């Protein structure tokens, strides 16, 4: 039976019902987080390219 | 009791229209699954767990 069972798994019998239902809310949890995962990627983009500056600001410190 | 897979988060369970008279609680708690027997069947050839 280990080899048997390896077959015809487990089932869900009170998530028939529901399935519309969780996967209209799954797209819509879906478009919000890819609308937060733009935002915060923008948002990563424009403070690495402030980090940069960092580079120009210390060479330039170094002058004597 | 209601299906949880792995790694979820979320768990929504719907109830549809009913009399709600004389209700008087909820109460919870979360149990693993391959502890928790398929009762209504007298028996269960994948429970392996003692």
């Known amino acids: 039976t280990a080899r048997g ?4 798994f487990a089932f869900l019998s ?3 019902s529901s399935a519309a239902s969780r996967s209209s809310a ?10 937060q995962l733009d935002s915060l990627t923008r948002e990563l983009n424009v403070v690495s390219q402030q980090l940069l500056d960092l580079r120009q600001q210390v060479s330039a410190l170094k002058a004597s | 009791l209601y299906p ?3 790694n979820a988060t979320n768990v929504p369970i719907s109830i549809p229209s009913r009399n709600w ?3 008087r609680g909820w109460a919870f ?11 209504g069947s ?3 050839p ?5």
């Open chain 1, 5 to 8: 069972i390896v077959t015809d």
């Open chain 1, 14 to 16: 009170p998530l028939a």
């Open chain 1, 26 to 35: 799954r797209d819509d949890k879906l478009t919000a987080l890819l609308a």
């Open chain 2, 4 to 6: 949880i897979p792995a």
């Open chain 2, 21 to 23: 008279a004389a209700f």
């Open chain 2, 29 to 39: 708690t979360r149990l693993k699954t391959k502890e928790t027997p398929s009762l």
């Open chain 2, 42 to 44: 007298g028996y269960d």
């Open chain 2, 46 to 50: 994948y429970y392996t767990y003692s």
